[PDB]
A paper describes a structure:
OPTN is an ubiquitin-binding autophagy receptor, which is initially found to participate in the xenophagy and aggrephagy processes, and more recently is also demonstrated to involve in the PARKIN-dependent mitophagy. The N-terminal coiled-coil region of OPTN is responsible for its interaction with TANK-binding kinase 1 (TBK1), which is a noncanonical IκB kinase family member involved in innate immunity and autophagy. Here we biochemically and structurally characterize the interaction between OPTN and TBK1, and demonstrate that the direct association of OPTN N-terminal coiled-coil domain (NTD) with TBK1 CTD domain is responsible for the OPTN/TBK1 complex formation. The structures of OPTN NTD in complex with TBK1 CTD and the related NAP1/TBK1 complex solved in this study not only elucidate the detailed molecular mechanism underlying the OPTN and TBK1 interaction but also uncover a general interaction mode governing TBK1's binding to all of its currently identified binding adaptor proteins.
Among the OPTN mutations, the glaucoma-associated E50K mutation is demonstrated to associate with a more progressive and severe disease phenotype, and causes death of retinal ganglion cells in transgenic mice. Obviously, the E50K mutation would disrupt the salt bridge interaction seen in the wild-type OPTN/TBK1 complex, but, surprisingly, the OPTN E50K mutant shows a roughly 43-fold increase of binding affinity towards TBK1 compared with the wild-type protein, consistent with our Co-IP result and several earlier observations that the E50K mutation would increase the interaction between OPTN and TBK1 in cells. To further elucidate the detailed mechanism, we also solved the structure of OPTN(26–103) E50K mutant in complex with TBK1 CTD. To our surprise, the overall structure of the mutant complex is almost the same as that of the OPTN(26–103)/TBK1(677–729) complex. However, detailed structural analysis revealed that the positively charged OPTN K50 residue in the mutant complex forms a charge–charge interaction with the negatively charged TBK1 E698 residue, and meanwhile its long aliphatic side chain packs extensively with the hydrophobic pocket formed by the side chain of OPTN L47 and TBK1 M697 residues. Given that the OPTN/TBK1 complex is a symmetrical tetramer, these additional synergic interactions induced by the E50K mutation likely contribute to the increase of binding affinity observed between OPTN E50K mutant and TBK1. Interestingly, multi-angle light scattering (MALS) analysis revealed that the E50K mutation could change the oligomeric state of OPTN N-terminal region (residues 1–119) and induce its tetramerization. Collectively, these data demonstrated that the POAG-associated OPTN E50K mutation not only enhances the interaction between OPTN and TBK1 but also affects the oligomeric state of OPTN.
Author numbering:
A (entry chain D): 679 to 719
B (entry chain C): 678 to 720
C (entry chain B): 30 to 102
D (entry chain A): 30 to 101
Amino acid sequence: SSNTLVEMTLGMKKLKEEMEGVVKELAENNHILERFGSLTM
Amino acid sequence: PSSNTLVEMTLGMKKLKEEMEGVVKELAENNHILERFGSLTMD
Amino acid sequence: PNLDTFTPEELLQQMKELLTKNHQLKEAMKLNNQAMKGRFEELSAWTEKQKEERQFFEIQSKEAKERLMALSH
Amino acid sequence: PNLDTFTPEELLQQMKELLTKNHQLKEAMKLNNQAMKGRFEELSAWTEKQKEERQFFEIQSKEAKERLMALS
């Protein structure tokens, strides 16, 4: 099923990558939140 | 594309869509609080 | 077929993985937001304490100076 | 049943929307991270400023007190 499976495959790969980037930003965000707790010490 | 596959594909897609709706919800809450940080020093 | 195109079973597979991850992200974000709240309350309390403590020494200083003026003249 | 199943075309369309939504989500978190760093540096600076002003007042208070008792 070229152009359709091909397309779905492309789209599923972009989604995966993109969500990897979100996890990245959350990680950073959690790190900053950690330091915040250290501010109040 | 077969029936079984599309059904499971459709079920997954709807779930991802729904799960994402809740994720943006959380994002919105996060934003709300972030805005409030800006006012901690201000009196 | 093409190595670089998913078979239907591979498609379904990718979907299941994405479900897992997305679900993980949701719970992670929920935990992140609870953390935000907690930090907010912590900083709120802490800044307030900083203000009070300054206020105290500021007033103490003011009164000490008033007394210095009144009792020298 | 038949209505409640997506077509390949429709599935693809959801993929596009979902990607877009995830992209917006990622970018919005990038900005949040930047803003938080800002908030953090602002709060660090602020508290340092409060501390300084505090121990300034504390010094001024003690100096007003000993100088008062300095006479006579």
